[PDB]
Write an enzyme that holds these catalytic residues in place. Structure first.
Site, mmCIF file in Angstrom:
data_model
loop_
_atom_site.group_PDB
_atom_site.id
_atom_site.type_symbol
_atom_site.label_atom_id
_atom_site.label_comp_id
_atom_site.label_asym_id
_atom_site.label_seq_id
_atom_site.Cartn_x
_atom_site.Cartn_y
_atom_site.Cartn_z
ATOM 1 N N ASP A 26 48.939 44.876 84.486
ATOM 2 C CA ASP A 26 48.138 43.672 84.707
ATOM 3 C C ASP A 26 48.039 43.324 86.182
ATOM 4 O O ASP A 26 48.894 42.648 86.719
ATOM 5 C CB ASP A 26 48.718 42.490 83.942
ATOM 6 C CG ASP A 26 47.808 41.263 83.994
ATOM 7 O OD1 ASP A 26 46.797 41.300 84.735
ATOM 8 O OD2 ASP A 26 48.079 40.270 83.279
ATOM 9 N N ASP B 100 41.556 41.540 87.799
ATOM 10 C CA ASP B 100 42.518 41.376 86.715
ATOM 11 C C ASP B 100 42.298 42.404 85.596
ATOM 12 O O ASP B 100 41.395 42.240 84.779
ATOM 13 C CB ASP B 100 42.361 39.950 86.157
ATOM 14 C CG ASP B 100 43.232 39.675 84.955
ATOM 15 O OD1 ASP B 100 44.212 40.417 84.733
ATOM 16 O OD2 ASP B 100 42.931 38.709 84.211
HETATM 17 C C1 LIG Z 1 47.814 39.558 91.629
HETATM 18 O O1 LIG Z 1 47.388 38.233 91.949
HETATM 19 C C2 LIG Z 1 47.287 37.408 90.789
HETATM 20 C C3 LIG Z 1 47.471 35.922 91.091
HETATM 21 C C4 LIG Z 1 47.180 35.089 89.834
HETATM 22 C C5 LIG Z 1 48.423 34.974 88.942
HETATM 23 C C6 LIG Z 1 48.231 33.805 87.998
HETATM 24 C C7 LIG Z 1 47.980 33.871 86.649
HETATM 25 C C8 LIG Z 1 47.875 35.058 85.760
HETATM 26 O O2 LIG Z 1 48.858 35.766 85.705
HETATM 27 N N1 LIG Z 1 46.798 35.379 84.983
HETATM 28 C C9 LIG Z 1 45.552 34.562 84.938
HETATM 29 C C10 LIG Z 1 44.828 34.320 86.271
HETATM 30 C C11 LIG Z 1 44.223 35.596 86.876
HETATM 31 C C12 LIG Z 1 43.731 33.281 86.033
HETATM 32 C C13 LIG Z 1 46.925 36.585 84.119
HETATM 33 C C14 LIG Z 1 45.869 37.650 84.459
HETATM 34 N N2 LIG Z 1 45.867 38.746 83.464
HETATM 35 C C15 LIG Z 1 45.595 38.250 82.101
HETATM 36 C C16 LIG Z 1 46.783 37.376 81.673
HETATM 37 C C17 LIG Z 1 46.609 36.921 80.237
HETATM 38 O O3 LIG Z 1 46.029 35.871 80.044
HETATM 39 N N3 LIG Z 1 47.074 37.621 79.161
HETATM 40 C C18 LIG Z 1 46.871 37.105 77.779
HETATM 41 C C19 LIG Z 1 46.155 38.176 76.930
HETATM 42 O O4 LIG Z 1 46.840 39.426 77.096
HETATM 43 C C20 LIG Z 1 46.940 39.910 78.446
HETATM 44 C C21 LIG Z 1 47.786 38.918 79.268
HETATM 45 C C22 LIG Z 1 46.902 36.164 82.626
HETATM 46 N N4 LIG Z 1 47.873 32.624 86.176
HETATM 47 N N5 LIG Z 1 48.019 31.785 87.121
HETATM 48 N N6 LIG Z 1 48.241 32.477 88.311
HETATM 49 C C23 LIG Z 1 48.462 31.805 89.524
HETATM 50 C C24 LIG Z 1 47.610 30.754 89.894
HETATM 51 C C25 LIG Z 1 47.837 30.061 91.077
HETATM 52 C C26 LIG Z 1 48.928 30.401 91.875
HETATM 53 C C27 LIG Z 1 49.788 31.436 91.511
HETATM 54 C C28 LIG Z 1 49.558 32.133 90.330
#
Ligand SMILES: COCCCCc1c(C(=O)N(CC(C)C)[C@@H]2CNC[C@H](C(=O)N3CCOCC3)C2)nnn1-c1ccccc1
Ligand SMILES: *[C@@H]1O[C@H](CO)[C@@H](O)[C@H](O)[C@H]1NC(C)=O
EC number: 3.4.23.15
Length: 334
Positions: A220, A35
Site C-alpha cells: 500500500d 495509493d
Molecule cells: C505514503 O504517503 C501516504 C500518506 C497518507 C497516509 C494516510 C492515510 C492512509 O493510509 N490511507 C488513505 C489516504 C491516502 C487518504 C490509506 C491508503 N491506501 C488505502 C487504505 C484503505 O483505506 N484500505 C481499506 C481497504 O483496503 C485497503 C486498505 C487507506 N490516511 N490518512 N493519512 C494521513 C493523512 C494526513 C497525515 C498523515 C497521514
C-alpha cells in the site's frame, strides 16, 4: 508504445509522500498521494462547504475554470480505513508525469478535519485495480495503458529516506535502476483486483510468533506505516516492549536502537527491517518517547483482515507493480 515517464514526489516527515498532477484546462495543480491500496482519483472540490476546514486549507478543483470539464454528478463516497470523503463524479483531462489522460475523478465536497487537516496532500490518485473502484470508474493507470504509450504495463515506487534531494519517484511504464540494486524478487498476487500477496510469517528476531499459518499483505503505497490487525499488532508490540497510545506505539527513545529486527516472509524470502527502519529516532533520551512506524489498521473483508506494507516498507524495498503479470517485484532501494 516506448514511453517511460516519472512523477517526482515530495517526502514530508517520512509520513506523507505525494506528487503533483494537473486537472483541467488550464491545468489546476494538486498535491496527491499515489495509493496502490485504492482505485479512485479524487481532489477537493470548489463545491465543498467551507465549514469543512480541510477545504479552506487545500487546493479546490473549480470545474467552472476548466474548459475541458465534463459533468457527471453521480454521488460517491470513498471509505478509507482512516476516514471518509464524499462528493460527486466529474471528468476532465489529468496530466500525470507529462502523460495526459481523460479521467473520471471525485470532486470531494465533504472532507473531514481528521485526517485531512493533517494532510500536506490535497487528494489521492488510486493505483489499484478497477475491481476496487467505487462506482466502477476506470482507474487512471488503466486509462494510461489504453493509450498504448507505456513501454510496459508496470509502475514502480521509490520512497526516499531523506525527508536538496527528491522525496521519491514513481516510474510509469518501468522502473529506475538509479534507485534500486540487485535483482527484483517477484511475488504473484493472490488474485487480480488487489495489490495483495501471501505472507508466510512475521518474525521479531529469529522468533516467527506471528502469521504462522499464512496471512495477507497489501502493498500500500498510500499508507504511512506498516500495519496489521489490532490483535496482530498488540502481540508484535508486546514482543517489542512498546506502549500503546491513541494513534501510535512508542518506546523510550533510548530503547529505540536496541529493538529487534522485524522480518516479513514474502514469496520465500525474509524482508527484514531493523529498528533504524521502523523507529522515528528523534532522540536517545530515556525521558522521551519515540514513535514506531507500525500500527493497527483493521481492514474488513473481503480485503482484510490483512497486513499492509506502506512507506516504512517501501523506503527499504523499491517496489515494482506489474499489471501485465499480476505480481509485485521487490528490490533493495538506494
Ligand atoms: C505514503 O504517503 C501516504 C500518506 C497518507 C497516509 C494516510 C492515510 C492512509 O493510509 N490511507 C488513505 C489516504 C491516502 C487518504 C490509506 C491508503 N491506501 C488505502 C487504505 C484503505 O483505506 N484500505 C481499506 C481497504 O483496503 C485497503 C486498505 C487507506 N490516511 N490518512 N493519512 C494521513 C493523512 C494526513 C497525515 C498523515 C497521514
Ligand atoms: C455518469 O456516468 C454514468 C456511467 O458512466 C452514466 O450512466 C451517467 O449517464 C452519467 N451521468 C451524467 C449525468 O452524465
Amino acid at each position: 508504445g516506448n514511453t517511460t515517464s516519472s512523477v517526482i514526489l515530495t517526502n514530508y516527515m517520512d509520513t506523507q509522500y505525494y506528487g503533483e498532477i494537473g486537472i483541467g484546462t488550464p491545468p489546476q495543480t494538486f498535491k496527491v498521494v499515489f495509493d496502490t491500496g485504492s482505485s479512485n482519483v479524487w481532489v477537493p472540490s470548489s463545491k465543498c462547504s467551507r465549514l469543512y476546514t480541510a477545504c479552506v486549507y487545500h487546493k479546490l478543483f473549480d470545474a467552472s475554470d476548466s474548459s475541458s470539464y465534463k459533468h457527471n454528478g453521480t454521488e460517491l463516497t470513498l471509505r478509507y480505513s482512516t476516514g471518509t470523503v464524499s462528493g460527486f463524479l466529474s471528468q476532465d483531462i489529468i496530466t500525470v508525469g507529462g502523460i495526459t489522460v481523460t479521467q473520471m475523478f471525485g470532486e470531494v465536497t465533504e472532507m473531514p478535519a481528521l485526517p485531512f487537516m493533517l494532510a500536506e496532500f490535497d487528494g489521492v490518485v488510486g493505483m489499484g485495480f478497477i475491481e476496487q473502484a467505487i462506482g466502477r470508474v476506470t482507474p487512471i493507470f488503466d486509462n494510461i495503458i489504453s493509450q498504448g504509450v507505456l513501454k510496459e504495463d508496470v509502475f514502480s515506487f521509490y520512497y526516499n529516506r531523506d525527508s536538496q534531494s527528491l522525496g521519491g519517484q514513481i516510474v510509469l511504464g518501468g522502473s529506475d535502476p538509479q534507485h534500486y540494486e540487485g535483482n527484483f524478487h517477484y511475488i504473484n498476487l493472490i488474485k487480480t483486483g488487489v495489490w495483495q500477496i501471501q505472507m508466510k510469517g512475521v518474525s521479531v528476531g529469529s522468533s516467527t510468533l506471528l502469521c504462522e499459518d499464512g496471512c495477507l499483505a497489501l502493498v500500500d503505497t498510500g499508507a504511512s506505516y506498516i500495519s496489521g490487525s489490532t490483535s496482530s499488532i498488540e502481540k508484535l508490540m508486546e514482543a517489542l516492549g512498546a506502549k500503546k497510545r491513541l494513534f501510535d506505539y512508542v518506546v523510550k527513545c533510548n530503547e529505540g536502537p536496541t529493538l529487534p529486527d522485524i522480518s516479513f516472509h514474502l514469496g520465500g524470502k525474509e524482508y527484514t527491517l531493523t529498528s533504524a527502519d521502523y523507529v522515528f529516532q528523534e532522540s536517545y533520551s530515556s525521558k522521551k518517547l519515540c514513535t514506531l512506524a507500525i500500527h493497527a489498521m483493521d481492514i474488513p473483508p473481503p480485503t482484510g483482515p490483512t497486513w499492509a506494507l506502506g512507506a516504512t516498507f517501501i523506503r527499504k524495498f523499491y517496489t515494482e507493480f506489474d499489471r501485465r503479470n499480476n505480481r509485485i517485484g521487490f528490490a533493495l532501494a538506494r
